Coordinates of N, CA and C in Angstrom, one line a residue:
X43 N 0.8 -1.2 0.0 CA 0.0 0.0 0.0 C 0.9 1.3 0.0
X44 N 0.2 2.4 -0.5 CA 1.1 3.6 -0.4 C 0.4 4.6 0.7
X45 N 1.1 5.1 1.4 CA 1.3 6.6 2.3 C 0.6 8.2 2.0
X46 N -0.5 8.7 2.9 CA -0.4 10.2 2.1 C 1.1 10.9 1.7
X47 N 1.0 11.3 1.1 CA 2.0 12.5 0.3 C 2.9 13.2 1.7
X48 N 2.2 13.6 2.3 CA 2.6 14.6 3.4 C 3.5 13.3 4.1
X49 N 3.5 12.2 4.3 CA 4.8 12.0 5.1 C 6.3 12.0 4.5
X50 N 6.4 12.5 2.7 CA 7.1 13.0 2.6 C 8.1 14.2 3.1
X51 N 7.1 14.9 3.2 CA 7.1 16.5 4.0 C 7.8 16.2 5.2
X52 N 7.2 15.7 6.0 CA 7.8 15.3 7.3 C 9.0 14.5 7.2
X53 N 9.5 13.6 6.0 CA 10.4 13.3 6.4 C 11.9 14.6 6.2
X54 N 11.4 15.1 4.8 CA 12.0 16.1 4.6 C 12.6 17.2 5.6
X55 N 11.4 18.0 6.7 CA 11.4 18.4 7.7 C 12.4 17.8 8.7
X56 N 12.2 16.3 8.9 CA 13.0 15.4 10.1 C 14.2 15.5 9.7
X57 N 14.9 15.0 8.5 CA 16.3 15.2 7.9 C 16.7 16.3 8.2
X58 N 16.1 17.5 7.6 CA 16.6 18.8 7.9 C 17.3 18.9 9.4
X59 N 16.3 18.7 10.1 CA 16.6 18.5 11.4 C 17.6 18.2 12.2
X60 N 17.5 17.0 11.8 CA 18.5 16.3 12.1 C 20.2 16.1 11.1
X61 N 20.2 17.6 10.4 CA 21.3 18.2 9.7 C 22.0 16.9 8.8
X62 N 20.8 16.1 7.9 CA 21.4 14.6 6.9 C 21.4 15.3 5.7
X63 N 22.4 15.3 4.8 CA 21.8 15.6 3.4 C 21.0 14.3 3.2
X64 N 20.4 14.7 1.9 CA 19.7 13.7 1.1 C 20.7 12.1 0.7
X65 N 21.9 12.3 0.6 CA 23.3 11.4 0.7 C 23.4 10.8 1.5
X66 N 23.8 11.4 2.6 CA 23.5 10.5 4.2 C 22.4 10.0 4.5
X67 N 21.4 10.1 4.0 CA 20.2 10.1 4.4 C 20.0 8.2 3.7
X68 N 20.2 8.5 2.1 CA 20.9 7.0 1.5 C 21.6 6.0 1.9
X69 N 22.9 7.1 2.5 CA 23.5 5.7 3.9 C 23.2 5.5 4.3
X70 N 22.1 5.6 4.9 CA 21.4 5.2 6.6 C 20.1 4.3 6.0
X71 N 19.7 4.3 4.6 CA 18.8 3.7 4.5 C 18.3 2.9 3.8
X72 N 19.4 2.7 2.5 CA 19.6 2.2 1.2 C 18.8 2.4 0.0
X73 N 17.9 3.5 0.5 CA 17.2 4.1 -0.6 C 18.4 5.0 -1.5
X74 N 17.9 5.2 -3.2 CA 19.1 5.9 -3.6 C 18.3 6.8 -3.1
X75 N 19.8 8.1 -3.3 CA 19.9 9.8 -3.1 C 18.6 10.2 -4.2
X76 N 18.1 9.6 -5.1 CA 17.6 10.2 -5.9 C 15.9 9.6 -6.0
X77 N 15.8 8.6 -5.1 CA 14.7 8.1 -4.8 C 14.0 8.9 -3.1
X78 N 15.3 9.2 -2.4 CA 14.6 10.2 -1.4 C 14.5 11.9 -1.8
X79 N 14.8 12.3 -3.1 CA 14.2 13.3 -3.4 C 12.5 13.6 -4.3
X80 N 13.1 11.9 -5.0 CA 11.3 11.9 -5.2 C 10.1 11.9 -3.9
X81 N 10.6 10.8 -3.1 CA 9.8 10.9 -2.3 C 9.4 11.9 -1.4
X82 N 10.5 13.1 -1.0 CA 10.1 13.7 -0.8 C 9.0 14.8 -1.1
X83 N 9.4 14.9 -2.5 CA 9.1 15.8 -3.3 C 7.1 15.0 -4.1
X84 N 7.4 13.3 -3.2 CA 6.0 13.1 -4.4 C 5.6 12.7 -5.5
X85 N 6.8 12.7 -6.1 CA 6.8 12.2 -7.0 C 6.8 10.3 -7.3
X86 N 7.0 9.8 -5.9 CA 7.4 8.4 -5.6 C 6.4 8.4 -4.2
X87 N 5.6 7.0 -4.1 CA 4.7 7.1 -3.2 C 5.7 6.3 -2.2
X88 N 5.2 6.4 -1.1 CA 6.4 5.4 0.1 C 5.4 4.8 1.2
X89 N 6.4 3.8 0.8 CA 5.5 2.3 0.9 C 5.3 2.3 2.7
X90 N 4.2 1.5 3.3 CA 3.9 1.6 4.1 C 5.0 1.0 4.8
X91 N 6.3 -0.6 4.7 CA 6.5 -0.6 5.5 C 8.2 0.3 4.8
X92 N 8.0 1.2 4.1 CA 9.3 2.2 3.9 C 9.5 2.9 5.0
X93 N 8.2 3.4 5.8 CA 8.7 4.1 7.0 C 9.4 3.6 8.1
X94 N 9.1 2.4 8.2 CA 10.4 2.2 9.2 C 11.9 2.3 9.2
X95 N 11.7 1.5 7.8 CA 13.3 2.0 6.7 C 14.1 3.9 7.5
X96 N 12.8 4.5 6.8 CA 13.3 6.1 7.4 C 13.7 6.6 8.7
X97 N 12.1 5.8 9.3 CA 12.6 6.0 10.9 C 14.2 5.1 11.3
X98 N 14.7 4.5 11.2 CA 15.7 3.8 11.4 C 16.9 4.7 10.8
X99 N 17.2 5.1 10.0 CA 17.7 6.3 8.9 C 17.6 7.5 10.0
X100 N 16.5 7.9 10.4 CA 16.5 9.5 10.9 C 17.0 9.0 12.8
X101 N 16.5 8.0 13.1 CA 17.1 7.7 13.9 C 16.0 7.8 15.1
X102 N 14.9 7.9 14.7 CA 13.3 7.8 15.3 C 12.8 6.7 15.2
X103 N 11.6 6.4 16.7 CA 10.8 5.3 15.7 C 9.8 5.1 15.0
X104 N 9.2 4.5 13.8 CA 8.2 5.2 13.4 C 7.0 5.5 13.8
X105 N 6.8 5.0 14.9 CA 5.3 5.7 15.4 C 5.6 7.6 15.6
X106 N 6.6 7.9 15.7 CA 6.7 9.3 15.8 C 6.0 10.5 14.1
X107 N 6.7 9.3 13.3 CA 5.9 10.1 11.7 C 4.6 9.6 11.8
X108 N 3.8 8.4 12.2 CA 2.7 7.9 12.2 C 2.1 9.0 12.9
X109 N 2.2 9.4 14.4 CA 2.1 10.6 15.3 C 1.9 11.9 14.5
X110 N 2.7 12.2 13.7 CA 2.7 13.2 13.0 C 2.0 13.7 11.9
X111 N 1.9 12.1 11.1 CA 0.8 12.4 10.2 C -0.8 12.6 10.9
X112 N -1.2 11.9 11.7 CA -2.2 12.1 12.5 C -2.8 13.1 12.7
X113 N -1.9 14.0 13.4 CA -2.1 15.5 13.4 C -2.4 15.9 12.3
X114 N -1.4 16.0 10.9 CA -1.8 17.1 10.3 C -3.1 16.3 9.5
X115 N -3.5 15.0 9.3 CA -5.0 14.7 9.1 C -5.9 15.8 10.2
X116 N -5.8 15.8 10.9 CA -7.0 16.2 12.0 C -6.7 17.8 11.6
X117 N -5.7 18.3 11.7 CA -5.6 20.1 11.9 C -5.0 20.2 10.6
X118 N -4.8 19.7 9.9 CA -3.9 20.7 8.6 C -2.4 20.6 8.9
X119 N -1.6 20.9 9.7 CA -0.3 21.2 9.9 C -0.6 19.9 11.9
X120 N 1.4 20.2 11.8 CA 1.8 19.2 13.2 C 2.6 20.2 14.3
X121 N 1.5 20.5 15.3 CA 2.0 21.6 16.0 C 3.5 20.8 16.9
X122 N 3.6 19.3 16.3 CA 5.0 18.6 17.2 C 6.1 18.9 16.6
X123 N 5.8 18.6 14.8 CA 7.0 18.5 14.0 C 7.4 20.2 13.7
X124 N 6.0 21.3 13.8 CA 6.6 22.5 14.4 C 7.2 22.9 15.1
X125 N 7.5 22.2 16.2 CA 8.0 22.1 17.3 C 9.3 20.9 17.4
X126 N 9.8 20.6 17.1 CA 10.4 18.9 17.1 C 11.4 19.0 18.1
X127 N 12.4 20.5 18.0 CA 13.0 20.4 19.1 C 13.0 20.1 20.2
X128 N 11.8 20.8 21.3 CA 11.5 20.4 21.9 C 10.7 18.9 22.5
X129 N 10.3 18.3 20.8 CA 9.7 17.0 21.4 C 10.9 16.1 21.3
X130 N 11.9 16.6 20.6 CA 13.4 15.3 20.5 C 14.1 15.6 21.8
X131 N 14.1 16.5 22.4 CA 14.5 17.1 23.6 C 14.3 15.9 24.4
X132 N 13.0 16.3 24.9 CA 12.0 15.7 25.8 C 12.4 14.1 25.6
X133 N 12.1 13.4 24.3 CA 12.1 12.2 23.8 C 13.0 11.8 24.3
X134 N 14.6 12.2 24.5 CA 15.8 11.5 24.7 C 15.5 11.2 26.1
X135 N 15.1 11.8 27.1 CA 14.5 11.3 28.8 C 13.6 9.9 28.7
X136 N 12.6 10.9 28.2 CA 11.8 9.4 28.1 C 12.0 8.1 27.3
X137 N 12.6 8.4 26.3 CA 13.4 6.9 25.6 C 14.2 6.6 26.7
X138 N 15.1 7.1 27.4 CA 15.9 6.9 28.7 C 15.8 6.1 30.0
X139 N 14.1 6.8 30.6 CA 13.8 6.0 31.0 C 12.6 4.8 30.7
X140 N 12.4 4.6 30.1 CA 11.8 3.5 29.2 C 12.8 2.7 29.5
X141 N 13.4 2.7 29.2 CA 14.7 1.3 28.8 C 15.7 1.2 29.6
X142 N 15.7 1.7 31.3 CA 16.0 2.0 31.9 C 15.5 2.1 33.3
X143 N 14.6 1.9 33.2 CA 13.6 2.4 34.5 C 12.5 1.4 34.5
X144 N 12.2 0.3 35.2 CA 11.3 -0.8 35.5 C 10.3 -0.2 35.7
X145 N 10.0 0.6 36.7 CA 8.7 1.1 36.8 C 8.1 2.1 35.5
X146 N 8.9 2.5 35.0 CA 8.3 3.2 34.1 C 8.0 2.5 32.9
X147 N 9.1 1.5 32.3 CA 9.3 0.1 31.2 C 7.2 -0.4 31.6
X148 N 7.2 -0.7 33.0 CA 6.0 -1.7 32.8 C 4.6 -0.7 33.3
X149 N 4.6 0.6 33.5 CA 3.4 1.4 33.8 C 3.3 2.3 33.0
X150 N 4.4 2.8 31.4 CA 4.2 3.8 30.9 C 2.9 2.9 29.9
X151 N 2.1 3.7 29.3 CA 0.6 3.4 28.3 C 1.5 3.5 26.6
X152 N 1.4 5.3 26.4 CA 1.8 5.8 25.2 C 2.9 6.9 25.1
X153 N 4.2 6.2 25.0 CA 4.8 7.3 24.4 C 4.9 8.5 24.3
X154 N 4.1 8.5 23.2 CA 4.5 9.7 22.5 C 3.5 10.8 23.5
X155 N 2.4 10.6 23.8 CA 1.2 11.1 24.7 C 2.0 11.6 26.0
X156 N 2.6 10.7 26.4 CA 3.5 10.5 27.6 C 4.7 12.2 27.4
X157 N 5.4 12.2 26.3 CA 6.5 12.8 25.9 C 5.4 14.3 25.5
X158 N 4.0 14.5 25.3 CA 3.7 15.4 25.2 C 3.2 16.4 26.3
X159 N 2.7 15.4 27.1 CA 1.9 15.5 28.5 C 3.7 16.4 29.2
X160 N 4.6 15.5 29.4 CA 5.7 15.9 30.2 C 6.0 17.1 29.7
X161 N 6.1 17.8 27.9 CA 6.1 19.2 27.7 C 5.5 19.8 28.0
X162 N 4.0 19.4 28.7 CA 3.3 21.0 28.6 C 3.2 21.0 30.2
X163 N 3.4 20.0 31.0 CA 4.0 20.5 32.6 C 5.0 21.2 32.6
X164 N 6.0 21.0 31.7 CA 7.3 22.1 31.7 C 6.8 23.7 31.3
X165 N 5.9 23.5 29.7 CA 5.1 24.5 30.2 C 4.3 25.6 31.0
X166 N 3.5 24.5 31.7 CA 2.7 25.1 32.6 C 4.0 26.2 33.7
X167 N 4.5 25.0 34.1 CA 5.7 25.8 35.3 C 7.1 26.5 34.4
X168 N 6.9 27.0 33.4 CA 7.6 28.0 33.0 C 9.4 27.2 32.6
X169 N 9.7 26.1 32.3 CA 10.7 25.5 32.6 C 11.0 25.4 30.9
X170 N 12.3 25.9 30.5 CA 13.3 25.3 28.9 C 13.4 24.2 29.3
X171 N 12.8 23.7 28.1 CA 13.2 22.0 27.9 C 14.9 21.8 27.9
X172 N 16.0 22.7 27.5 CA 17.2 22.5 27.6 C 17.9 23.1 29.3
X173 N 17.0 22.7 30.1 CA 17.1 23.6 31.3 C 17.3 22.5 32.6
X174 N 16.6 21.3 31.8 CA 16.0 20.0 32.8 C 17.6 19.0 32.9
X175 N 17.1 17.9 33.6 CA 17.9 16.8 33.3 C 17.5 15.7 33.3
X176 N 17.9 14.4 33.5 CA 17.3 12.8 33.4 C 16.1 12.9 35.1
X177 N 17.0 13.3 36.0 CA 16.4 13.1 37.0 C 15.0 13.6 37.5
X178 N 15.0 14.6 37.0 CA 14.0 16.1 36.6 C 12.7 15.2 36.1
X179 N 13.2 15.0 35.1 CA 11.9 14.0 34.0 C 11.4 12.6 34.8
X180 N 12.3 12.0 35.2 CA 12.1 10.8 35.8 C 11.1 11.2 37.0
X181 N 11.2 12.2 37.4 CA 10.2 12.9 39.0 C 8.8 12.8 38.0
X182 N 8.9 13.9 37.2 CA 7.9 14.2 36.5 C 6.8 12.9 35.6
X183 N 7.7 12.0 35.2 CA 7.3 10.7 34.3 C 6.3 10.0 35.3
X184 N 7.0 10.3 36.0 CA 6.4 8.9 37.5 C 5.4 9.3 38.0
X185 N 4.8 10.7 38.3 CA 4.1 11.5 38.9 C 2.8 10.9 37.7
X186 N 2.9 11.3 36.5 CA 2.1 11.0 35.5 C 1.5 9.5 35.3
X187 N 2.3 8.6 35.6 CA 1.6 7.6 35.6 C 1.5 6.8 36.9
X188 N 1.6 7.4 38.0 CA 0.8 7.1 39.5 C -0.6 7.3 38.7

């Protein structure tokens, strides 16, 4: 099966991001360099299980572009991947303790939900996501899923 269009966009967006050219982007994924500019561009539809291919490449997992597309189905635009900094921020804690932390490994639900909920308590209390640390989040993570 093939993919809306727009998770091109997003992967495009993610690369950027994550400072890959379109070249690196082929090392990491064995798509050619000229097959990830179709795709971005749409001209090439991408195959449902290609996103994992990318996520593995950008160094995400794919439920995060899944996540993304979601959004912009529902609103038009992804107020996350507008934002990515602070959700890859955030993400590295919580990937952290996930795989790392028993209690959190077997009481967290979702992810990504999880990684959204912990930004907007940094939010609420005025706090830079580059301001925090592992320990910080781990208070925070645990509080959310009591």
């Amino acid at each position: 099966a093939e993919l809306p269009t727009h998770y091109g966009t997003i992967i495009k967006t993610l690369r950027k991001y994550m400072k890959l050219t379109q070249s690196k982007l082929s090392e990491r994924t064995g798509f050619s360099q000229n097959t990830i500019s179709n795709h971005e561009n749409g001209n090439r539809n991408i195959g449902v299980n290609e996103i994992e291919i990318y996520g593995k490449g950008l160094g995400i997992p794919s439920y995060i572009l899944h996540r993304i597309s979601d959004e912009f189905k529902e609103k038009g635009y992804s107020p996350t991947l507008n934002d990515f900094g602070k959700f890859d921020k955030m993400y590295s804690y919580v990937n952290k303790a996930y795989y790392n932390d028993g209690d959190i490994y077997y009481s967290s639900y979702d992810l990504y939900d999880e990684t959204i909920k912990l930004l907007e308590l940094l939010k609420e209390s005025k706090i830079n996501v580059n301001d925090i640390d592992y320990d910080y989040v781990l208070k925070l993570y645990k509080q959310i899923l009591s």
